[PDB]
Amino acid sequence: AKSKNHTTHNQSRKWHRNGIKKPRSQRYESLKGVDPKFLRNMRFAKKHNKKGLKKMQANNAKAVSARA
Amino acid sequence: MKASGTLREYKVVGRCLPTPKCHTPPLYRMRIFAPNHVVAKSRFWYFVSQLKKMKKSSGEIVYCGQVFEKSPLRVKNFGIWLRYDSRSGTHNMYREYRDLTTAGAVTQCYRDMGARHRARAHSIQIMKVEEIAAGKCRRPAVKQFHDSKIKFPLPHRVLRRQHKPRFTTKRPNTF
């Protein structure tokens, strides 16, 4: 009882009925697969930022506000 | 090409677009027989593409004008040059016709070709049309009319009104 083996007929119609839209592009996609050393350095820079940010950046903001 | 109804003569001039390598193209002209200016321009583009490296995108048509016959009241003889294509192979041909207008002679040529050789208008290239004198007429069917004091009756004329008096007691005399 030989039958049909494999065809791709009437497949593009099934695909285009729902759509072949591109994947959802969003900001801050992901951080997976990134170098572990680079990720560790980024975490350290993010967690040590508020130590010196809230003072020197505030002083510079006051200075630029006095400038303009 | 359809060649529907009567044909028309069009003088069509055209040149390629001015390119930085060379400007002022030679502005080639052609004399096309077509029913209207659209198919006239199309046939001109086809011929100039077959002749030289010119296309509709890289070129342009400057002027396309209807050409009237210089003597529509005179009976003239025209020699037509054909480059037609048969079922087996394409062949050249020289025909002669007798008509008042050049477009009329070209129509007669198209009809006679389609009738005698079953050649459609797709594969008929009109090469040259020129008015010839009665001395250079090689065709006997045309040469038999170059005789003054020509006299011949019209024998066995058809009725042509078979259905207007469809029922009658008459039998047409036909004389």
């Binding site: 994947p23 997976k32 | 502005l27 052609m30 100039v48 002749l51 480059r83 090469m127 040259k128």
Partner: protein, 157 residues
């Protein structure tokens, strides 16, 4: 039944071009690749260490990861049903920059310069692109030379 494989049917795709065999040119190594730049993928046969799959050949994607001898690229691979954003780690031997992004950057620089320069003059410059408009009415010239008559050549075998 078609013998699916990792390098099936790349006999002419992964081969080196004619008269270009030998060691790799050193200019392709000194190129800089940062995160976020749009690059292209072209499989090279000189090296076989980090070459991509045959389905990503000629594909353009952005870089999301950088390492010592390779880069991570996010490629939009169209599977039978939809498109998947796949992360691929390929060496720098098979990657080159995409000039489309460079042309776009040059165009945006020209635009933000032209507008900044014309703001003072008050001239509303048309910096937005457009399609090729139909050419306007022009005057040809024949300089007395009659247009040459064209006639179809008779058929000759």
């Amino acid at each position: 039944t078609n013998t699916k494989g990792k390098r099936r049917g790349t006999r002419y795709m992964f081969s080196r071009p004619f008269r270009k065999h030998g060691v790799v040119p050193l200019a392709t190594y000194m190129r800089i690749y940062k995160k976020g730049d749009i690059v292209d993928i072209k499989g090279m046969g000189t090296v076989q260490k980090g070459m991509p799959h045959k389905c990503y050949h000629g594909k353009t994607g952005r870089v999301y990861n950088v390492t010592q001898h390779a880069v991570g690229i996010i490629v939009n691979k169209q599977v039978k049903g939809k498109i998947l954003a796949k992360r691929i780690n390929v060496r720098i031997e098979h990657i080159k920059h995409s000039k489309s992004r460079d042309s776009f950057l040059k165009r945006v620089k020209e635009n933000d310069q032209k507008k900044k320069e014309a703001k003072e003059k008050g001239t509303w410059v048309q910096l937005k692109r457009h399609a090729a408009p139909p050419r306007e009415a022009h005057f040809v010239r024949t300089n007395g030379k009659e247009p040459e008559l064209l006639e179809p050549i008779p058929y000759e075998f």
